Amino acid sequence: KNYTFRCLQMSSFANRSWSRTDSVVWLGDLQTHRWSNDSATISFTKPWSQGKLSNQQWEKLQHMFQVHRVSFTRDIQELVDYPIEIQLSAGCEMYPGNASESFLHVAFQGKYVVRFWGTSWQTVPGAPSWLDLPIKVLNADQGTSATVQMLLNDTCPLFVRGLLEAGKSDLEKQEKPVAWLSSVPSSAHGHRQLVCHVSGFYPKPVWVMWMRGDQEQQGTHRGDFLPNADETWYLQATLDVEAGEEAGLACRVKHSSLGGQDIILYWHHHH
Amino acid sequence: IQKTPQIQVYSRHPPENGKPNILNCYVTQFHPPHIEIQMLKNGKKIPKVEMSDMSFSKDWSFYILAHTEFTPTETDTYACRVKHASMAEPKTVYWDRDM
C-alpha cells in the first residue's frame, strides 16, 4: 500500500585517472535493475523490469542515463583530496489514491550534502561551503533542471505504476518461513541465550515471541531483518534464561503466508 | 576510513548434518564501499562464494550479502573474514551454531 522506488548510484574516484559508477534499483525490498561500470546497458533482475514501457520508450530512457553517467564522471573530475565517494538516491514513494512523492538525494563521503527540490539543486544546511558555486553552475543548466523535474514529477510515478502491474505476482508472493531453536553463550553468568531462527519468509512483516503457555516473554529481543539470497528474509528472536528456566518455553511465529496457523516450536520437544 | 563493517553469519535452512544448506555472510554499516569478504571452512578460504550487488541504506552506509552452498558436519567450523580501510586488522566472525 506504499511502494518505495529507489535508484541508487555509487561512484568512487581514486584519482584523476581512475573512477567507476555502479547502480542498483529497488521496488520495496525487490531488486529490479543492476548497472555495473563494466556494462554499457542497464540489466533487468526481473522479467517485469521494463514495466509497461515499449522498447522505444526504454531505449530513450536508457540512452538519457548513459549520457548522465558519462557527463557526471566528467563534471565531477572537472570540479575536483582523493579518494572521493559520491552516492545518489533518486525515486518516488507511491501512496494509495494515485498519490506519490519524488526525491533526489546526493551524499559526499557518506554525508548528505545536496538534493533536487522543486525546480533547482540545493546544498543542505551544514554542507561544505565550496559546494555553493558548483551548485550555482549546475543550476544554470535549465535543460538538466527541466529533465530532472520531468523524471521526478512524471517518469518516476508513471514507470512505477507499470512495474506494480507487470510484477503483481512477485510483489504479492507469499513465502512460508522454516523455524528452528538453538542456544548461544549469554553475556550473563548463570544464563544462556535461547535463539528462535525464522528463515524463508516473504513479505517482510513478521511476529516472533518466546512464550510460557499464553504468557508472552516480553524480554524477547527481535534481531535485525537479514536477507537470504533467494529474495526471502531471516530473523532471530533471543531470550536470555537461567539454567532450568528453559523447560516449558515455546517460540511462536505469526506471518501472512501462514494464514492464521502459527508455527509453535517447544524447547526440548525431544527429551 | 569512515564506518566499520558489522558481520552476521547465518544458515538459510536449519543446519542438519549431511543435508545441503546455504551459509550467509551479511556485511553492513561500512564506508567506503571498497571491501574484501572471505568465507572460511576450518580456517581455509572457500572458493565458490556468490556475492550480491553492493547497495546502501537510508543512512548511506553500504551493505552486501555473500553466500555459499555447504553441507554441515559435526566438526567443520565456518567463519566470515572482512578486510576494510576502517580496521587495522581483518575482522573474523564465526558461525555460532554449536557455540
Ligand SMILES: *[C@@H]1O[C@H](CO[C@@H]2O[C@@H](C)[C@@H](O)[C@@H](O)[C@@H]2O)[C@@H](O[C@@H]2O[C@H](CO)[C@@H](O[C@@H]3O[C@H](CO[C@H]4O[C@H](CO)[C@@H](O)[C@H](O)[C@@H]4O)[C@@H](O)[C@H](O[C@H]4O[C@H](CO)[C@@H](O)[C@H](O)[C@@H]4O)[C@@H]3O)[C@H](O)[C@H]2NC(C)=O)[C@H](O)[C@H]1NC(C)=O
Ligand atoms: C515538479 O513539481 C515541483 C513540486 O514538487 C516537489 O518537487 C519535485 C521535484 C518533487 O521532489 C516532488 O515530490 C515535490 O513535491 C514543482 O516545483 C514548484 O515549482 C513552482 C514554479 O517554479 C514553484 O512556485 C514558485 O514558488 C515561489 C515561492 O516558493 C517559496 O514558497 C513556497 C510556498 O510556501 C514554497 O513551496 C517554496 O518551497 C518556497 O519556500 C513563488 O515566489 C513563485 O511565484 C512566482 O512565480 C509564479 C509562477 O510563474 C508566478 O505566477 C508568481 O506571480 C511569481 O512570479 C512560484 O509560485 C514552487 O515553489 C515549486 N515547489 C517547491 C516545493 O519548491 C515543479 O514546478 C514541477 N515541475 C514540473 C515540470 O512539473
Ligand SMILES: *[C@@H]1O[C@H](CO)[C@@H](O[C@@H]2O[C@H](CO)[C@@H](O[C@@H]3O[C@H](CO[C@H]4O[C@H](CO)[C@@H](O)[C@H](O)[C@@H]4O)[C@@H](O)[C@H](O[C@H]4O[C@H](CO)[C@@H](O)[C@H](O)[C@@H]4O)[C@@H]3O)[C@H](O)[C@H]2NC(C)=O)[C@H](O)[C@H]1NC(C)=O
Ligand atoms: C512503506 O513505508 C515504510 C515506512 O516509511 C517502509 O518501512 C520501512 O522499511 C525499511 C526497509 O525494510 C525498514 O528498515 C529496516 O528496518 C529493520 C527493522 O528495524 C527495527 O527493528 C530492528 C530489530 O528488529 C532494530 O534493530 C531497528 O533499530 C529498528 O527498530 C532493520 O532490521 C533493517 O536494518 C537492517 O538492514 C539494513 C539494510 O537496509 C542495514 O543497513 C542494517 O544494518 C540492518 O542490517 C532496516 O533498517 C524501516 O524500519 C521501515 N520503517 C517502518 C516505519 O516500518 C516500507 O518499506 C514501505 N513499503 C514499501 C513496500 O516500500
Ligand SMILES: CCCCCCCC(=O)N[C@@H](CO[C@H]1O[C@H](CO)[C@H](O)[C@H](O)[C@H]1O)[C@H](O)[C@H](O)CCCC(=O)NCCCCCCc1ccccc1
Ligand atoms: C539523475 C540525475 C538526472 C539525470 C538527467 C540529467 C540530464 C543530464 O544528463 N545532464 C548532463 C548533460 O547535460 C546536457 O545534455 C542535456 C540533455 O540530456 C541537456 O541538454 C543539458 O542542458 C545539457 O547541458 C549534465 O552534464 C549534468 O550536469 C550531469 C550531472 C548531473 C548530476 O547527476 N549532478 C549531480 C550533482 C550532485 C553532485 C555535485 C556535488 C559534488 C561535487 C563534487 C564533489 C562531490 C559532490
Ligand SMILES: CCCCCCCCCCCCCCCC(=O)O
Ligand atoms: C531520477 C528519476 C527516477 C525515475 C526514472 C526511473 C526509470 C527506470 C530506472 C532504470 C535504472 C537507471 C539507473 C540510473 C542510475 C545511475 O546510474 O544514476
Ligand SMILES: *[C@@H]1O[C@H](CO)[C@@H](O)[C@H](O)[C@H]1NC(C)=O
Ligand atoms: C589510481 O587509483 C587506483 C585504484 O586504487 C590505483 O590502482 C592507481 O595506482 C592510481 N593511479 C594513479 C595514477 O594515481
Ligand SMILES: *[C@@H]1O[C@H](CO)[C@@H](O)[C@H](O)[C@H]1NC(C)=O
Ligand atoms: C568504468 O567505466 C568507464 C567507461 O566504460 C571506463 O573508462 C573505466 O575505466 C571503468 N573503471 C573501471 C575501474 O573499470
